[model samples]
Target chain A: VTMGRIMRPDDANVAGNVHGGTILKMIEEAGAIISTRHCNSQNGERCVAALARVERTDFLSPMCIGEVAHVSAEITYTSKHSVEVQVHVMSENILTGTKKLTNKATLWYVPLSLKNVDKVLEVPPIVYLRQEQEEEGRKRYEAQKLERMEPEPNTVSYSQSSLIHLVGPSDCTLHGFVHGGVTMKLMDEVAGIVAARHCKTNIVTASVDAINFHDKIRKGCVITISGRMTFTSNKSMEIEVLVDADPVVDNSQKRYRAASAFFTYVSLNQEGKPMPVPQLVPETEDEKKRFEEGKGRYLQ
Target chain B: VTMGRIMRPDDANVAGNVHGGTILKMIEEAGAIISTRHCNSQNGERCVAALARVERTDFLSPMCIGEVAHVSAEITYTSKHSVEVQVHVMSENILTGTKKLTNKATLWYVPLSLKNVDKVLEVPPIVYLRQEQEEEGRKRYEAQKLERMEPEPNTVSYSQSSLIHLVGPSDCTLHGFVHGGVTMKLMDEVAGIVAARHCKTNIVTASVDAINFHDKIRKGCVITISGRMTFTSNKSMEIEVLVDADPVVDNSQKRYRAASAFFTYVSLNQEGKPMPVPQLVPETEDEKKRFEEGKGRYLQ
Candidate 1:
């Protein structure tokens, strides 16, 4: 699937370049379109695609306003319950008609039955264009499956901030669940606020760790997106962000964790150059555990 | 000029319908694109188009997600300093390959010189396809011009609220100024908050009066968007919103008015039906004058 749009002024960052979060939103959007279509191509309303995980994303080049942003997505690997989508983004300047690559991202999506969202739908087998491609993709798929078996870090801390949002139709998929891109954008906003309040300086998003959607958040639910500083070095800060959904309409007042991710940001001075940030010192046991895990990821 | 994009989940309202403000943003975006290109079609960066005024907009139909939204703009009238653009919005449902009209809007744009921001560029003469088209458009142009010479209402009020927004690149135009649609969306948000606070119930935008732009707001400036409940009837409420820009980087701490508009909203019940709202009683002299003006506009 492919989507193209002229990057308007509102899509840029404070530095006149397209924001990393903005590009990620488009990448998720494109991935969702192709994955959903692929899952339901054989029959009508069989299943709807939901974002399961997003790998690391790096902005290779800065895109400017008035450039046409082109996003393309393709299904790279398909398991029984998930599909891996490779998405690429490029920018074209209309005035000069020059195009350049801006970003490339890999996203994983799971298909849920339309009749019963709780039921995971099976993915159809892929038809490889070239011979021996099947063996090649399965190796990467097995490698990812093994990585998913890894452990997680502690989920508590200081220098924390949270935002409460009422889920509306604008934030949901046609199936009435929140879209991955919208949730990611809000998570990024909260992460930025956490970093800003921690250092009291200008900050920009540098990278985002694997964001995994644990559960679905339906429309009309109240979601509390919270973020806390996990680790901070001289130049960068790692924030662990989590989204909790509270179903207000139902009789039960229970809240559940919906999604979680770790976002990394770099401090910048007024000159738009990277600057040193205040180092974080862990006080509690939970804080120390999270800090160590964050350091491990940073070192990797 | 024209633009098209597939509406995603984030573009809809709580009722699964596309938001009027969302469509309005596209209209302004399309208008700006065409007007700017037309003003500088011959040379390189002679001028950039800034939105000056938006005529009354009426949402004829509701649109849904997954539909391809097409926005087209045409220059209907041009004066020495401004170009009037007639913009139309249409939605196409690709699932069934059906299309329908969604909205029609009239927006006015003024071209400012790249060298001198204060200098208004002359609009090139338009070539008409039909005979006597020039005289036909001139009549409407003169009519709007005569209406533009009308008076304003008092600014002070009760039941008022405001939002402080630091101008970022995401909110600005290519020329380093805030985009008209971004400002409008922020104004609408403030107006909605004002109405919701007054009525203490669900409210939705009904319509908007002519929005007039008074000054340019550059990037890095701080803008205070304020709104107040001016008048309320049995079912609807009228709000007056104003944007004031303060240049923070400059040595002087001067603030200037950027834009002003009146927004109308109707209270809605839980069943998605229009409901009666609480009446407003003006107390102070300024509030009384503003209330009277709002009443006059509503009566007209």
Candidate 2:
């Protein structure tokens, strides 16, 4: 419900701008805090939902040096075991009494009971006061389901792949998770291969539409970044990348979906110009639908 | 022109994929080393090209842990004060006897004269191997000239802004300079304000198309990040942010351009959708040229 913190020199860039990675960490913690408060108190059990996905995150503005980021998270929508939390962040310039909305993010969590293995924790009901809040909450609930829609099997055959790596102490942030920016770079590299594989040409990252942080990659665990080509156009392709961290001792599919992002890339020819890529032949209905979705986003 | 190094655990994420900032640091050093060797070897005095800007950098493949990033650099283009170095990074797996092109980055540097306060070094002539490489170099030369084409005075009047902050220990990388990702975040915040001021509406970062790290930000030095609106669209704005680092004890105009980038943002209305922004009225010739240039990029 309440999360307030200072923007310190150590946590900022050379120009004193706070990192989106750092901001993501804060958002996750605040979202989890409220989730923990509700599930533990109301349910009479200590339960916390691991982040399932982030519906959307908009970095509205840059939070500057010496500014204060007052973060607030509210459980807008709740299901039996999954909860959607909407987080709002405002940057305050106390000296001038100036403040404005700097960030807005929505994260989803799946409740897990600590004492019971393989049990889904039932979450408490959420209250939406105003029409705007209630309606937006409903929209998020549907969108979360839509965003979680998995791709058709072999839609981009052989393109869906995974690579596992063991986490070391140095690769982690102070809080013992991999730095968000580090995760982002790895995601880009993993996703870039899919784009490269399809186009068979050199490619450049055109844009990163969205990166959803569902869970944190803890230290000493094996992190897997996997992805496939979800959509494509003549000049560019959209590759989906996911981050999963599993324990070194028990490497299982029970590993959380750490992060996922849609990466768009433009292929280049030997002449350094945007080159036309071969079109994918959609063999199934879902593949055709995904192609259209990619086209729509490309137009947008 | 060649530097081979192991990707240690300290310089990578938990997944072993190198951080973009880590690669950027290596690029800066290698870029500066060649710039230093060039100015010194030819001019009979030691000097270096303080980073001015970095052009398109495509992360083609991932450099994993224990692998080698065999980086090589060549001077592609040069001016009286600035030099453009094209850097190529290849990942080599010794045991597998495998090597592949991982990244290609272009960086610009301004040579500082050891003899005087405000002077440029005379760089030796660069010989191209093939017609294609030479042609690409020429294109870059002209493009650099065009990019240097400044906006008219008071184009986005009252939009040019800057902020100063001192660097700390935690803001730095393993090599002891500010991290590139942090600088990027700050630049976005600075430029984003200009974007917000233009529309006076909620905004989202539509794209960060380019970030050029021209120089390293030394620890304890006061950093000045300034921005000016160079271009605008019906719904977005492009702000040019520059980084200048100077020692705290000795603050001078000697503060060189540590980096510069173009940030494009889309304004959103209260309904949380794309909103048309007010058109930027160009007052003079250069401003009009930049306006059309921005339009071309937006259309592309």
Candidate 3:
């Protein structure tokens, strides 16, 4: 799958620095479309791909406003239940006709039935040119599973905040469910708030753990995003964010847990150097339990 | 001022009801552009109109996605330091070739020198054929001044939340200062969160008090938006939001107070009916002082 967008001024900060989260959104949007189409290529099952996990991504160059962002995604590996997509982002200056490779990312997506969002669907296998490529994919897939199986981390109530947003048409895909990019951006915003509340300083996202989609939230649903500090290290802090949805159109009374993820942020000083994070005092048993789990992940 | 925009999916919620804040942003953008151009029409001194106040705006009908929003503004009156613009919003259904008047608003804008943002400029006055019309304009202008002179309100520490956003290119005007509409939208978002924090229920903006722009915020600056609940009536709540900016480009250490406003919200039940808000308990002398001021406005 390939997509291109002209970067607007809102896409970059005054320093001409585009947000890492904005690039993450473009990666997920491009990757999901490709993975979902591949899922339905063999068998015609109406499906939508949900972002499962993202590998570490590093930006080689900063993209500025007024440049054209060309994103290309290719399906690299497919298992029984998930598809792996490799994406590359390129920045093109129209006036100068100059181009630069900005980012490379690996994303995993799971295809789900659109009619029955809870039903996870199987993906068609991809044909590999070499036997070694197949073996490499299998090992990577197993590694991701092991990482996801690790114990999840949770504490301070006052530092906790919730953003209630009604899903609009622009936030959804053609299937009427919220887009992975839109949801990811909102999650990042909530997590940033939680981190700032704890450190009371400038903070930037370090990385995000596997974001698991438990259920699909449809358009016309009000989503409540709750974020809280789960753990803190000397320089980094982890926040756990959960999204819940309630259908407003049909007057559905049942609330659904949609997604959950852990975001890591590093506090920065006035000089933009990473600074020591304040120690989190766990007063409750649940808080202490979550802190230990976070410590375990930090060690890994 | 005249602007036409096709409403996108993101402009409306799941039920296709466009947000009042979104419409307000459009109104302010239209009004500011016309007023600013008119200010420089006589003798161009390169200026930008900062929103001073918005009169009571009532939406006559709900606008939907895929419809064309036609916004038009005209200068109704002008003072030495400000211009009053009357704006009308019409929704056009292209499919049916039908149009309806959706909103009517009166906004006041103060033109400031682009080079020296602190220097306020006078607007060229409009001529009226009838003396009675001139009298009416003067009465309306005086009414707004009296309303703005009303006692301001202040409140609690915990419900207080701040959103830090870096001004990007998309949020700025041609000269590089932030747009009045962009700042207004963000202020509304922060105020919405504060309202939800206090009520812990569904909340919608009821009205907004005058938003006074004290300083100009340029692109490349980090804006800190602080919103806190100042007072709560039986069914309505008031939140005071203040925006402060710190220059990032030249590494300026001084912080500037940019703008401030009072936003009013009404709590709603799950059935979408108005509901009573919880009583706010003032814990400090400052809180009590703000509460009394809020009470004075509520009575008016």
Candidate 4:
């Protein structure tokens, strides 16, 4: 729906590279486009009547300085109250003649209609390229719904101070992407929250078992993060967090799975020593399995 | 790659969506997976490397609260010094059988040799599935090389403040995508750069001739943005900006083309009033044609 360029100075580190937050902003913009288009087609106004509900994305590659990239989105299916859209991304290097492939995502939107502000319109039929893809998407949506039927019981509570802060322009590099340290700082902060929640006290990061970056977050893009307390033991809490990005411009943002981590936090006392913590209670088999898996990661 | 979750409280907006900056952080972690893979393959040890570059990305949809999004990256191509990666992003709604299509991106990375305090080693080739895609990518790289042979000369200089800041986490929506204002801010900033480089003074955003949101930039994807001072007159500097995104973890990190726009900037005096600027100088007929075509967008 929209196109832009990645500049040379926006790169991070000694190497001229961009940040992932920048790309996330672009994805969010794209989602806005799809949401707006779906609403406009159903109702002839360009106002926000609904909001973007869910986004599942995959990062396939990276773009370098002096490279040109393109993004495109189409309304794969539409309903009177909801719409489904598909987006595609690609890029090329102007200097090295290198090109890369990107992944596609589906977005769902619901129209916002209030009795006083705007009346709800009649639902319309869904449209798509083929019946098969549409049906597949629908099935996948149903599966997701079933998986989220119940929320995991809270095993512990933690402080939120440990989460990382999304740096502002003041903290940006010449290339417009945030410093890796800043990003990590935010991650550590969130990880602390989960840890503290489990231990009911201060927690320290024992080790970062693993951290994978699927995309760069640029200076201008927004950053969203959340954490869940998965399990707890005598002194440690296991947590999982998911992060993603959305852009300011409509139809120019990409939503992707940014990072997921299993963190181990140990409770600490005023003396800065480890302390005993709460025990985790597994309400379901899945929760029990998750706790076991996290324990394994810690042991390794 | 690192990841975080979106909490219910994080979705403070009326739309029940998480902050865009939070999403950007998550996506950046996903993009990092590609960089980590590259580093791991090189030394058989996990190493942290900042994002170097990103390419084309399209943001087609949005992600909302109570939804789970996944971000992952892959190495698309690698050279002695640089590795190309692609990040795959996806999301699903936990409440409804709904899905959103998010775009992908490519990233380029160089290992952090200094951190390891070791001598730099050659990066080995990565495995891939499609050889034809590699061949096509090579051809595209060549074409890009030819296009960058000559830098366009400036006739009028745009001010720095006029340029928009599109590729960052802080300036975008809650979805981590670049906001329209941010995109406009970037256009204004780049236009000012072009105007000031040519006319040698401050410049103000006069108007945006045209803008189209083609795709979305995910929260953590690298964003590629470029703007050229297309035309200049006594008081106006005409410029165009293109924005895209790519995953940081993939081999390509080049799949991005999120948004594009044509903007106009007017030279300003210290008194904050409009001032006269220089005229553009076209060295080649092709350059002249580009300037002319860009000017046409304003009229349209």
Candidate 5:
């Protein structure tokens, strides 16, 4: 399914150029909507999920002010509890009928229940029109499970953590939801520590896969950002960070996985140059799996 | 003079690595401090009116946590209402006692007034101790004087993502690209929301780190701003926003670490003094790390 939005003055910078934050939000919203439509059991309570990662994204063109953006999403891969989506963005000039491709991004999502707080539902199978499409899906499926590889260390040995705090009014956007930028900052901060613990050296954000805001985090809720170190290299490490927004309701906790991202960090020497770090000793099966996934992010 | 800051968890993404924006913040703080002192002596006022420009920056190297960034600034030129300052950044390892210059830039600042901020004040004097010093000052002044002759920036309504309208003279810079400050203003609106949500009361803009721009939001390209929250304390939050110019032509993507600042917005009550909000509840290990980091920025 695809969605669209018209460029507005608020979207552009000083000279009518747009900001990446604006483009990310548009496709993210469309992707979330497409995910909601995909997971809802035919008129079910609008099943939706948050992004686990943006495996890759390539921005092709800039969408300017007074331009139109067309955002589309398709289910490319799915697991028992996860779905991989291909989201594309394009720009157009309605007056002259000029249009161009803008962006291509692959995202992963995990469906959670709206009626039942703790349930994870399997996403519907994607109907591929061609054999090559299914083959591509299979390829990704095999790659995604690298998280199960061995020669791994204890997943518990690498690192773990949680950032808990109240979501106050000042933390929200005009729509009363927490702004995407705020969410990104918290995720970065949480990931920074896990990377720091593994290397014991100062660090710099090397890169980020894709961060998906699966749902809106509102004011007056408690947002807990948690994660662990997934991989380590000579100079870089990958940390998987998760953000969950929980509201207290009638003695029970209503928690939602709000957002998640994969962050890459490079350790720095005393002079602030990239430096080699200690090797990982993954002892657990899950740790080994994450090691493979983390390794793939850079090697690919 | 040099100012030092130890990289903390909040400074990094989930990878415990620092960000270019974070690196820029240290340098900006030094510039702001230097601006206050230099302007106070010459212009009879010590505030920054506008950051006219930044030039010849070198990303000398990468840096990490526990590293101390020593930022130093020097006045390179003194114009009537403007002063060109050269700010250099060096990352040091306290444990090893080794350091290297990681970055350097020329920042232009217009002086503000003591009573009326709308007025741009004239600088008093420059006691150059060496011939080279006077020569360096004259060179910057003349160069800056030429740079100033360019067309004005978005003079009026400050600045979009997904639209397709034909742009005219209104949304343009002198050379027909876009004004950098206009894009920053849009992000600022989003930036304010991120901080407002954290404190839940009135807030004020404390500062903005330098926006390191490498690409132009060209006349025919699209623009985008992407960002996330890197940290938050009792009354302040760090918002890192990225701006990009999506080419109307090719696929050579330009990555940007556009703008950020330790927006120290205070939570004001009916009485506009220092006030406390709620206590932080860091739950996950990563969250605790970030909470500590967001906390550490104030102390640092």
Candidate 6:
């Protein structure tokens, strides 16, 4: 059910490029579909559903108009009543026939059964071999196992965040940049992916801890965003994100640190109520160390 | 200029998001800045210059321990003789509060002097108003016969060719959810705003065109994309895009269309290009009738 599109003029910056918010909207729409699929799959019979919540997202790239854009979602693991889904994004070029990688995200879904019953019923295991090349599947599984391990102690773990720009002439404010509300919307959507991954449950943004503008991201430059699940607790996950600028060739091609933020998310039950979640365990000593060190910021 | 990032385990989709190659790496870096600086004064200086070329980009988003990311470049519109400088990129999210937006792109900068050397520079007379309200600026300009116009347009355009996916534990393939690459990479990056706007020298991607998926955006979904500047000889522009997906999403909240396309852009130049442009003058009866019949596409 995922829907996606190329950013257009309505989504541009003052310099006349796609704005980031436009791209984020496409990502969110895709994530919502993924979440819906997971929820409907809980039943032997698939059902249609809407995105109730987004768990976490990390912006890995920027999207531009006239580029081919796509968004997809899939059901990963299903529990009794809930399922986990993933959404991915990418873009391409038509003239020179070049393409660029963009960003990826994860989402959580709960069945729409009125009782909110956990459908522990057995279904089918995801057939990775059917979809992936044999060698690629093997390699991916190994990587997945490694990621499952907890973080190291005392050392910090950071995942790269890519900035995405949605260019639009009308989308800008009087200052020539995109609107602040638009940026906030993108941050909220991106944070959802990280939150869902950590909580392993449907999650919603509880609050924006902070958004700091380190420098200005000009209109023409594509904005890159990167994010990660920094810390997690029984009920919430904390995500840290960074935003930067990557200018286009016809544009100035200027680069700068645009903004950064921290987000707090809480897991939600089928009824949209806050719920308890699993604790994130660091796999390696370094991850553990990083988690412990990050704990200090929680208190601060 | 360009930036790059290695995809990590956490970045994968059910199949993996899109392949780095299929995605427009350069635009991803640009999108981050667009998201960060919504509604700020720095928007005017930004612009997309040229999408020169691209090489092999490691498909890290799907299978990897952790990928490194970077961004670099030179100004697009600078002085003549020197032509446009090149920018470069290399980045990582090392701190808690910062997020990284990663993508790779190759762009060419053209000196502004070459194009505008003989053109008459239109410097509108400046007027100051003592009103405290920000909206007053718009009012003052309107009073001075500076008719409100659409945002600027780009000089040229490009497109994406194909997309690939890397599936993760949380992503799956069901109901034919094509890879995110199938849609996102092409539309969002390759044929996206930067490519179009950069060519025109003053343009932006304003909104999403349209998204429709025939299949599910499944885990490890792989897709191919292609785009081009279908029609541009004027301040008005249009782009055509195409995408292909494999094993897309099913029963998710996401929406997919079999195929969809739309155009949104504005043209701007101190001295408009001499190339043939779409004549916007609706002076005669037939011209006025045609203009009135197809004006909805420009509506916000």
Best by DockQ: 1
Q: Candidate 4: lDDT of A231?
A: 62
> In candidate 4, what are the lDDT values of residues B1-300, reduced to their tens digit?
322232233432233333333333444444543454456554543333344444434333445554545455566666665556666556554323355644365555555443453334455666667998676655644543354452334532222223222255444332334444344344444554555566665544455532444454555666556666676656776776676566675536567676665666665555555777767776567768877886675555
Candidate 1 vs candidate 6, DockQ winner: 1
The reply for model 6, stretches above 4 Å from the true place, is: A1-163, A166-171, A174-176, A250-254, A283-294, B1-300
lDDT of 5 at B154: 16
Model 4 residue B194 distance off true place after TM-score fit, in angstroms: 17
Candidate 5 chain B, run of 10 with poorest lDDT: B152-161
Clashes of each: 0, 2, 4, 267, 71, 242
Q: Give the alpha-carbon lDDT of every model.
A: 0.79, 0.65, 0.76, 0.51, 0.58, 0.41
List, residue by residue over A1-300, the lDDT tens digit for candidate 6. Answer: 343343444454332334444555565444433443344343454332323234334444444444556555566554444444566666654323455666565443333332333222232344453545434534543444354362432112332234476544333322234434345566755676555545545655554542333344445556666776666666766677766667675654556666666776666566555687666666667656656765765666
- What tens digits encode model 1's per-residue C-alpha lDDT throughout A9-108? 6675555556667778888887886787678655545677899888887666667777767787889888888898999898866444467998788889
Best by lDDT: 1
Candidate closest to the true structure, highest TM-score: 1
Q: Write the per-residue lDDT of candidate 6 for residues B154-239, one digit (tens) a residue.
A: 22212213333444322221111222223344454544443334443343332234333323344444444455444433455444
Off by over 4 Å in 5: A1-158, A250-253, B1-300
Q: Comparing 2 and 6 by TM-score, which wins? A: 2
Report clash pairs, candidate 2.
B51-B214, B54-B212
Off by over 4 Å in 2: A8-17, A94-97, A127-136, A146-219, A226-240, A244-247, A250-259, A263-295, A298-300, B1-168, B171-300
The ten-residue window of minimal lDDT in model 5 chain A covers A147-156
lDDT of 5 by residue, A1-300 (tens): 544344656665444545554666665555554564567544444344555556545445556775667667777877777777787878865433468988787777766665565467777776778988777887886765564252133243555767887876545532235645457666666776676666766665566675545576766778899978877777777788888888864357577788777777666656536788777667668878888888887686
C-alpha lDDT of candidate 6 relative to the true structure: 0.41
lDDT of 3 by residue, A122-224 (tens): 9988899998888888899899889777612123776788899999767776557787777878887788778877887776667777676656778899999
Output the lDDT of residue B89, model 5: 75
lDDT of 5 at B264: 36
Give the least accurate 10-residue stretch of model 2 chain A, judged by summed lDDT: A172-181
For residue B163, give model 3's deviation from the true position in Å. Answer: 0.8
